[PDB]
Amino acid sequence: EDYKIQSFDLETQKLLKTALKDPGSVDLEKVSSVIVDQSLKDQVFSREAGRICYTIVQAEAKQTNGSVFRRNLLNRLQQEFKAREETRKRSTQEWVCLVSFICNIFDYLKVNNMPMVALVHPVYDCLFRLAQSDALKNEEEVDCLVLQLHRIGDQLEKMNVQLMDELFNLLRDGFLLQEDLSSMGRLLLLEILEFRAGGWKLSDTAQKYYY
Amino acid sequence: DYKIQSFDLETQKLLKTALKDPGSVDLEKVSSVIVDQSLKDQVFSREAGRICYTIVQAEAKQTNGSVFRRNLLNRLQQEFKAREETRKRSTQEWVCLVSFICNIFDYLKVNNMPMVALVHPVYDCLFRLAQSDALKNEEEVDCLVLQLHRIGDQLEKMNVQLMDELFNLLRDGFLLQEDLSSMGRLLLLEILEFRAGGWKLSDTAQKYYY
Ligand code: NI
Numbered sequence: 576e577d578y579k580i581q582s583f584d585l586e587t588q589k590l591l592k593t594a595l596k597d598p599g600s601v602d603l604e605k606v607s608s609v610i611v612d613q614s615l616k617d618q619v620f621s622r623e624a625g626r627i628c629y630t631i632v633q634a635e636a637k638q639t640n641g642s643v644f645r646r647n648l649l650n651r652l653q654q655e656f657k658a659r660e661e662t663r664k665r666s667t668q669e670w671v672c673l674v675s676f677i678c679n680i681f682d683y684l685k686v687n688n689m690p691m692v693a694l695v696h697p698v699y700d701c702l703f704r705l706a707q708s709d710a711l712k713n714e715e716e717v718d719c720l721v722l723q724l725h726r727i728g729d730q731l732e733k734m735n736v737q738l739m740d741e742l743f744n745l746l747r748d749g750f751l752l753q754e755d756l757s758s759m760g761r762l763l764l765l766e767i768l769e770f771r772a773g774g775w776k777l778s779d780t781a782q783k784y785y786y
Numbered sequence: 787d788y789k790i791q792s793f794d795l796e797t798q799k800l801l802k803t804a805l806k807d808p809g810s811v812d813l814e815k816v817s818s819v820i821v822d823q824s825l826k827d828q829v830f831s832r833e834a835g836r837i838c839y840t841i842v843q844a845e846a847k848q849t850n851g852s853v854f855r856r857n858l859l860n861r862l863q864q865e866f867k868a869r870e871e872t873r874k875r876s877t878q879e880w881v882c883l884v885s886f887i888c889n890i891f892d893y894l895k896v897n898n899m900p901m902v903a904l905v906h907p908v909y910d911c912l913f914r915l916a917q918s919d920a921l922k923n924e925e926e927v928d929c930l931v932l933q934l935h936r937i938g939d940q941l942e943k944m945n946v947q948l949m950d951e952l953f954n955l956l957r958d959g960f961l962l963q964e965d966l967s968s969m970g971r972l973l974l975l976e977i978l979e980f981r982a983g984g985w986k987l988s989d990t991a992q993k994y995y996y
Pocket residue numbers: 687688689690
């Protein structure tokens with residue numbers, strides 16, 4: 576149904592819709608390229624691109640037994656991931672979009688509900704970046720971080736619990752020690768600390784307190 | 787081990803007699819010496835429930851009486867009612883009083899049925915410790931989290947809405963009140979995680995905090 580592609584050109588939406596049903600009829604390298612381009616420019620699409628990406632990947636595998644789209648999508652994703660520090664320096668918004676996109680691809684591009692190990696290190700590297708002092712000092716980055724933890728924290732922890740323990744240690748540190756967090760940042764961090772402590776869920780009383 | 791090292795030699799003897807033979811002592815006096823000393827000694831304020839329980843049971847068995855229990859709880863009430871003036875007089879005496887009340891709650895049971903008469907005295911003390919001005923005092927925060935580690939799960943079952951309200955104050959003090967010390971902030975975060983984990987300390991949190 577809803578692939579959340581409202582932010583694109585009418586013409587580009589037409590291309591994406593065509594890719595969905597008949598990937599053999601489109602240039603899948605180009606399709607991957609327009610998807611990753613827009614994922615950096617639109618908050619909603621950065622958080623929802625996985626829906627259309629999974630559907631094209633499945634369609635291509637069923638049609639031609641091919642993974643041209645996936646390979647091109649993940650190559651481009653790796654290119655953007657590698658340039659994440661310069662992207663963060665250029666634009667906090669493009670950087671938080673990139674993180675949401677990588678994490679959304681992790682969640683949707685599955686073999687069963689087996690995630691792709693190739694995405695584990697990209698996801699963790701981004702979350703660890705967000706958990707540094709000089710990122711927690713930015714409320715936009717904290718919002719991004721906790722969105723990913725709500726979305727895929729439980730799955731990620733399974734993929735590597737020690738990394739998750741180390742990540743949450745940074746979160747306690749930032750929460751405990753670092754003075755220059757906004758009220759909204761401090762609140763987001765406390766909620767996610769309670770969220771993991773409760774087994775990646777929101778108790779009724781915490782729901783009422785925060786929301 | 788009844789943790790009575792802080793008493794005089796003569797009072798230690800009275801207490802050891804009372805445990806074995808409550809019928810041969812002035813039980814009103816025994817309760818009096820116990821509450822007096824619970825305000826004065828940290829270790830005794832946290833452990834007096836042990837000896838209190840034992841005398842209560844010794845007396846119920848020996849004479850079917852509750853002179854000790856009634857006199858102990860009467861005196862506890864008198865101290866509880868005087869809590870504001872006690873806190874203003876001595877922060878140390880006040881946290882000893884909180885430890886003592888919560889220790890009596892934990893030990894003076896029927897089944898493991900706590901006494902409802904102790905529920906509001908316990909909660910009132912914890913709510914006082916959770917106020918902005920008390921959170922600003924590291925000694926009061928240490929007292930608060932000790933009680934919550936000891937009897938929080940038990941208390942919550944008595945009245946969950948009060949526990950929910952108490953933890954709302956803890957989040958508030960955590961989030962908003964600037965004048966907490968690094969130790970106070972550490973203790974509060976641990977108790978928040980502790981309750982959220984079902985009154986349990988995760989392995990990773992054990993390592994982080996202890
Ligand atoms: Ni799975």
